[PDB]
Structures are given as C-alpha cells and as structure tokens.
Amino acid sequence: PLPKPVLDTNGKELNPDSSYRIISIGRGALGGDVYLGKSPNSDAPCPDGVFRYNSDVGPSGTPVRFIPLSTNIFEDQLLNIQFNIPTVKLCVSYTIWKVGNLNAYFRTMLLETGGTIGQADNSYFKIVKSSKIGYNLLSCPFTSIICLRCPEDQFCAKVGVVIQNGKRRLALVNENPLDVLFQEV
Amino acid sequence: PLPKPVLDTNGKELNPDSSYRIISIGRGALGGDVYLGKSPNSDAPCPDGVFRYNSDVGPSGTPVRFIPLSTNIFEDQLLNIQFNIPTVKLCVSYTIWKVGNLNAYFRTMLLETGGTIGQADNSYFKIVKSSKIGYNLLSCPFTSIICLRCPEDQFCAKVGVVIQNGKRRLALVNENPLDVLFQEV
C-alpha cells in the first residue's frame, strides 16, 4: 500500500516549499490554467473565486502551493491548496482554497478562497492520478462527519468546471473531471 | 431485497397523509420529543430550528409528515420531513426539514426548516431501524453530487443531538444517533 508522491511537469516530486501553476495540456480552446478571480457580484473584499482561463493563449495561471498533513505530498491524501501571491493583509485569508455552500442554481459546490489550513472544514482536497492523463483534484469536504459505509468514512467528489457568467468556474462534478498537471515555477 | 415499510407506535405502516410526533422512549431526563423552535438569534422571520425537549415531562412534540419519492414510505429511502402545523404564509416555507451549512463551532450541520420538497438539496433524509430499539434518521445531503465509492454514490450521516444554547439541537453526529419512534396522531 506504499504512498506515491505526486509529481510536477519535470517529473520531480511535489514539494511543500515550492510553488506550481495548475495547468492543462488542452490545446487552444481546450487549454487554460487555474487562477484566482473575482466571483460574479461578490460581497467579498478580496477576490475569492477559483477559475481557469478560456484558451491556452490566456495568461499564466496563479501559483499555488500544497500543505499536506504530514511532511510529504502523496496521492489520495487530505491537503490544503493555497494561491501563493504577495498580498495586502485583509486578503491573506482569501488565498486558501475552499469548497462553497451548495449552490442551488448549479446543483453543486464551487471552489473559492477563504478556506482554512489544517482543519476538517471545506478546505480539504485530494490529488489522484487521472483515469486519462495527468491528475484530478477531489474535494473531501465534511471529513469531520462520518460518511456511512463510504471509503474511510469520507465523502469525496471530483473537481470540474461549470460555466458561471461565461467564465470557467471550478466546481464539484460527477463526470469529466478536470485533468491537470503541476508545473513548478 | 424487498422494501420494508417504516412503522408507527401502534405497529401500523407509515402513511403519507398522516401526521406523527417523533418521540423518544427515553425515561425522564432521557426523554423529549422533537419540535419546531426558534434558533439562537435567528434572522429568520419564522422559527427555523429543529429541537427535542429536555425531559419526557416536556410538552408533546411537533407533528410532522413524510413525503417519499414514490407513493410509499420505506426504510432506507430518500424522503422529506415537514412539520405539519397550520401557519401564516410567510412561514409555510419554514416547516420543511433541511440540513444547514457546516457550522464550524459544532463541526457539523444542524437541522432547520426552509428546506424544499422533491429536490436533491439539503432536504433529504432517510429512515433506518436503530441498532438498538426504534428508528434512526439519516441526512443524505448532496445527492446531486457523486460520493466516490460511497454506497449508491450518496453521502449520508446519522442524525443526533448537540447542545446549542442549552437546548437539544438536532444535528449530524457520528455516534449515539437519536433513537426515535413515530407516534401517529
């Protein structure tokens, strides 16, 4: 059952101290890197939404880092994902990835910032290798609650995209999970 | 795999058109029936919290009814639980049982009203026979999302009690699920 490290674009294992852009290998329209953005009509003082660009010719994605629970980043393990940007203090809260409350309109939960690090709230994610090529993010929210007969009593869902206000919003999906790669800086 | 009906205090199968108090067989301090109550400092125009009384000598619980997805009420099936009381219109929304957003303080979700009937939001519950005596409520929120490898891709959690502002608040628990019986009116 030996823990396998997640790996970057260069093949080198993922490192807590490093920074990575979460990139697609999608060509053209199918490409687009993950970035921090303002949410459609957000009350939030900072940008709090989690998006990807629309085409590969879009700007480079926002860097993020990974904070595991141990000292290493393995596949299939709870961890936190935090945009790594310099910032004004009000905003430092709003870099940590989080899964939002059920959005009735979309019938699922969107990814946003202002999560917390090291706690069993909405801020937990997993990395897993894609059924195709590259990696998939899962959200395992509510690990503080027993998921009856679920694997390890946890509820997890694959992360995908929904189109909110014509952008690409990262949300929980059931199929077509976002395939990603991690490209060190 | 033959569907089994849930049963009332008299032994008679549970009926959609009927009303029931959700009662405990707890003696004295251990007793207390489920009722509709105002939530600690609620912004809500109506009472929106789901409570049980503190002792068996407390008043009779609030009647509720069950709205299945078929025409029958079986164990282990998604359904809606709605307080059955006459009401002013503003409030008719706030009878349907619902599971709230993660409450960070309690580290779980509380039961409240203003859920919806017939949709895969936070308003879904299951009835199951208790490992002890009587029945347990489960909440299966988020059935619109695949729970990876979970039973039937659903996330479910047992319903219990937490002490909020010194009352008994129905919430999602991991152990000591509330044992209940359904007593027709």
UniProtKB/TrEMBL annotation, chains A, B:
Transmembrane segments: none annotated. The keyword Transferase does not apply. The keyword Ion transport does not apply. GO terms for molecular function: serine-type endopeptidase inhibitor activity. Keywords: Disulfide bond, Protease inhibitor, Serine protease inhibitor, Signal. Belongs to the protease inhibitor I3 (leguminous Kunitz-type inhibitor) family. This is KTI-A protein. It comes from Solanum tuberosum. The lineage of its organism: Eukaryota, Viridiplantae, Streptophyta, Embryophyta, Tracheophyta.
